[PDB]
Amino acid sequence: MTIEELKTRLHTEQSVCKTETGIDQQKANDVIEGNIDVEDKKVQLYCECILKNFNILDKNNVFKPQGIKAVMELLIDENSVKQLVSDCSTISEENPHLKASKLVQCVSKYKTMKSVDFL
Numbered sequence: 075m076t077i078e079e080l081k082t083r084l085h086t087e088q089s090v091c092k093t094e095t096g097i098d099q100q101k102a103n104d105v106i107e108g109n110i111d112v113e114d115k116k117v118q119l120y121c122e123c124i125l126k127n128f129n130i131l132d133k134n135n136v137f138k139p140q141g142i143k144a145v146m147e148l149l150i151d152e153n154s155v156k157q158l159v160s161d162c163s164t165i166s167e168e169n170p171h172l173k174a175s176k177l178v179q180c181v182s183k184y185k186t187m188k189s190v191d192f193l
């Protein structure tokens with residue numbers, strides 16, 4: 075996947091997931107910029123939708139290190155990808171919707187979805 079292809083893919087998922095969840099565009103823009111309101115229901119649903127569509131969360135809401143590696147290896151150095159994988163593997167949440175927003179918040183510390191547009 076190229077950067078330009080990832081840019082297009084992120085825009086597609088952001089649009090599909092906004093329609094599917096009913097999240098307000100400004101709230102979706104906050105998520106894209108890495109400002110995640112983890113406790114907000116629509117933010118949780120939007121985060122879940124994006125992570126599932128990128129194969130980062132499986133049907134059982136288990137974090138898939140290979141899914142995040144496939145995206146992040148295009149954006150950050152190899153040692154930062156390994157750090158992100160170990161860091162975000164520590165998120166343990168019985169509520170799968172809260173798990174999804176906590177995961178997007180974790181990934182956002184390394185690179186935001188918005189950051190890809192300036193590449």
Ligand SMILES: C=CCc1ccc(O)c(OC)c1
Nearest residue numbers: 128145178181182185186187
């Ligand atoms: C990994 C796919 C979606 C995604 C979620 C949160 C992010 O911060 C991100 O940055 C590139 C990408």
